Symmetry: C3
Subunit: 244 residues, 3 copies
C-alpha cells in the first residue's frame, strides 16, 4: 500500500485493488490523467508516460524528480506549526499566485495541498489558486512518500498536455489507464465521449486501455464496447476494460 505525497480527500485508493486485477500487462504505462499518482506508485511497469493538463502539477513533479534533496529540505520548513493558521495560509496563497519562480511555487504548492480545504486543487477565472484553509489537526509532512516518488520517477517522463496528446504517445508495448474527472451524478460531456472514441481507436491497434468513472447511463453509453466491471463501495463505480 504506497501513499501519494499529495492528498486527495476524494480518498480514492480503495479502487486500487480492482484497478490492479483488471489492468493488463506491458512494458509501459501511459496515464493521461495522472493526478496524485497512486496507480503509478503501486504498479511495476518498466517505464511510465505520465501526463496532466495542470502545468503546476507537472512542474512540481519534474522538480521532485530532478531536484529531490534541495526540494525536500526547502519544503519541510513550511510544516512547522507557526504556519498552521488562516492568516499565514492566506499569506502563502497570495505569494504563490504572485510568484514567477517555478521552485518556490512547487514548494508552496505542497503546502496548499496539505493545509487546504479537502486537499482540493482549484482555480478562479483569473487563474489564481482558489481553495481556502482546512483547519486540520496537524498536517503530516510526507517526507517518506516524497523520496519514494522521486525514486520511482527515474523510470518516468512527465508531460503537461491534454488526454488526446498523451494518448497518442502509446505504442504496441504500452498500456493506457484513464482516471478522467468524474461523470455527472472544466471537463465537458463531449470530452468524456471523445475519451471513449480514442480508446476504441487504441484497441483496434492492439493497445489495451482501462477507464474509471461513476456507474451511470451516460457512462455505460460511452463505454458500450468495453467489458464492464462494476465495483462496490456512495454509488458504485465502473471499470471499462478494452482488450484485444
Amino acid at each position: 500500500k504506497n501513499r501519494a505525497f499529495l492528498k486527495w480527500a476524494g480518498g480514492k485508493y480503495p479502487l486500487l485493488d480492482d484497478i490492479k486485477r483488471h489492468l493488463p500487462k506491458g512494458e509501459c504505462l501511459v496515464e493521461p490523467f495522472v493526478g496524485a499518482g497512486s496507480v503509478f506508485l503501486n504498479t511495476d511497469f518498466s517505464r511510465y508516460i505520465l501526463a496532466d493538463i495542470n502545468s503546476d502539477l507537472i512542474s512540481l513533479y519534474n522538480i521532485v524528480k530532478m531536484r529531490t534533496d534541495e526540494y525536500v529540505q526547502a519544503a519541510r520548513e513550511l510544516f512547522v506549526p507557526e504556519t498552521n493558521c488562516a492568516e499565514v495560509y492566506y499569506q502563502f496563497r497570495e505569494e504563490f499566485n504572485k510568484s514567477q519562480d517555478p521552485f518556490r511555487r512547487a514548494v508552496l504548492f505542497l503546502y496548499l495541498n496539505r493545509y487546504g480545504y479537502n486537499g482540493l486543487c482549484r482555480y478562479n477565472l483569473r487563474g489564481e489558486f482558489n481553495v481556502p484553509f482546512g483547519r486540520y489537526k496537524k498536517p503530516y509532512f510526507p517526507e517518506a512518500e516524497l523520496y519514494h516518488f522521486a525514486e520511482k520517477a527515474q523510470n518516468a517522463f512527465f508531460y503537461c498536455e491534454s488526454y488526446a496528446d498523451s494518448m497518442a504517445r502509446a505504442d504496441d508495448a504500452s498500456v493506457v489507464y484513464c482516471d478522467p474527472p468524474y461523470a455527472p451524478l472544466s471537463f465537458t460531456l463531449e470530452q468524456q465521449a471523445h475519451l471513449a472514441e480514442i480508446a476504441e481507436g487504441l484497441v483496434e491497434r492492439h493497445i489495451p486501455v482501462l477507464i474509471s468513472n461513476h456507474d451511470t447511463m451516460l457512462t455505460r453509453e460511452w463505454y458500450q464496447r468495453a467489458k464492464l466491471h462494476v465495483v462496490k463501495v456512495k454509488v458504485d463505480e465502473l471499470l471499462a476494460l478494452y482488450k484485444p
Copy 2:
C-alpha cells in the same frame, strides 16, 4: 393483480388500489398517458380510450391488438440466451433506429424495453432511441401478459395524440385517469402541468369526473387546488379527485 408486459421500474405498479379506491365508476375509461397500461389492465370498464404521445408505443399496442400471434411468435425469438449481451443489444438498437417497418420495430421495441437500462424509454434529439444496455441477467419473456393485453384490448381504441386531444373525447358516460410525467422535486413543461389541471376543471364543470396522480409538492398543490386531495405514503404521492 395483472402485470403489464412492459416493465417501467419507476411508477412500477405499487399504488394501484389507492387509485382504484378513488377512481369513480362509469362506462368508459379515458387514459391520456396510458404508458405501460397498469390501470387499464386492473380495472373492468365496459370500454377504454387509451392514448399517449409516443408513436412507437401506440403502434406497438395496435399491433398487439390485431396481430396477436404473429407478434408473440416473432417476439419470442429475441428472448434466447444468444441475445443477453451488449454486442447484440447495440445491434438491435441500431436496427430499430434504422428500420422503417412498423411490425419489426415493434418487435425490437419490446426487446429494448426488457434488456435496456431500467426499462426506460428515451430518445436523443435526432429522435433515436438512446437507452444503453441494462445490467441484470435473467431475461423474462412476458407471454401471459402479452395475451392478457390483447384480450383486454378488444374493448379499446389507441390514439397517438397529446393529453388535450384525448381528454376532449371523454363524454357523460366517461371517466378520466391522468398519470402525467412527474413534477420536479424535449419534456413535459410546467405550463402543461398547469394546463392539465384546467382541462380537468372544464371536465367536472360538465359532470365528467377526473382523477390525477403526481408527487405531493408545493407546485402540485397549487395546480390541483380545486380537487379533493388525498395523500398516500410509500416521497409522498398525491391523488386529486374532481367529483361532480
Copy 3:
C-alpha cells in the same frame, strides 16, 4: 426559549444556544435579516435595530408594536374553525394580494403564515403571494407570542431596507448579527454574499463586532476568511469578527 409568532419554514431554533454563546455584548443589537425574530426574542439588549427587505414583514411588525390589542382582536377572528378549508384559504389569499390597506394586509398575512404550506413566504413574478393551502389539522393562534413580541418591540426600531443600509446604522455601542439566506450546497446572489462579509470587515475595523451564520462550505470559508470560525452540528458555521 421564547417562541416566535411566525412559523419560519417551521423554524427549529437549532443554533440558538451557540449564537448566544458567541454573540458579544453591547447596548444595541442590529439585525439586518430579522426574519421571524428568534434572536431578538431570546436576548436581553437594551435596544434593537431590526430590518428586512421584506416589506410585509416590516409593516406587520410595526403594527404589532403600535396597535397591539387592535391587532390581536382582528387577527383572532381569522382563526375560527369556519376558515380552515381550501375555499377560504384561496379567498383570503386573493383578498390579500388585492388589498391596499396595510392593517388589513397584516391580519391576512398571519392567517397565511399559519394556514399555508410549510409556512413559507413566497411571491410569484407579478409580486402576488404564491404559497398554496397547507391543509393542517388545527392551527394554533399564537396570542401569547404576539403579546410577548409587542412588549419586546417597545425597545426596538423596525426598518424595511437592504443589509447595507441597516448595517450602516451600527455604532460603537452596537453588535451586529447576520442571518442571510443560505449559501448554496429573485435570489440573494453570491455577489451579495461576498459583499456582506466585506461590510463586516469594515465594521470590525471601526470596533463594532459582527457575527454571521451560514452553512459550512468551501465558498463560505472563503468569504469569512478573516473571521474566527466555529463549526456546529449538513454542518453549520458561525463566523465571528472580534475586535
